[PDB]
Amino acid sequence: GPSQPTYPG
Amino acid sequence: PVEDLIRFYNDLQQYLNVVTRHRY
C-alpha cells in the first residue's frame, strides 16, 4: 500500500 | 489530495448517472 496514507482530523 | 479524490468520485459517478438512466 501507500507509504504515507492520508488520514482525517 | 485532489486528483485521487475526484478520480474516486468520478469512477462511481458513472454508476450513478449511467445505471440510474435505466430507472435505477
From Swiss-Prot, chain A:
Subcellular location: Secreted
Family listed: Belongs to the NPY family.
Disulfide bonds: none
Protein name per the record: Pancreatic polypeptide
Gene behind this protein: PPY
Taxonomic lineage of the native organism: Eukaryota, Metazoa, Chordata, Craniata, Vertebrata
Function: Hormone secreted by pancreatic cells that acts as a regulator of pancreatic and gastrointestinal functions.
Native source organism of the sequence: Meleagris gallopavo (Wild turkey)
From Swiss-Prot, chain B:
Single GO MF descriptor: neuropeptide Y receptor binding
Family per similarity comment: Belongs to the NPY family.
Positions of post-translational Tyrosine amide modification: 24
Organism: Meleagris gallopavo (Wild turkey)
Name this polypeptide is given: Pancreatic polypeptide
This protein's encoding gene: PPY
Swiss-Prot/TrEMBL GO biological process terms: feeding behavior; neuropeptide signaling pathway
Keyword flag Lyase: no
Keywords: Amidation, Cleavage on pair of basic residues, Hormone, Secreted
Full protein stretch here: 13 to 36 of 36
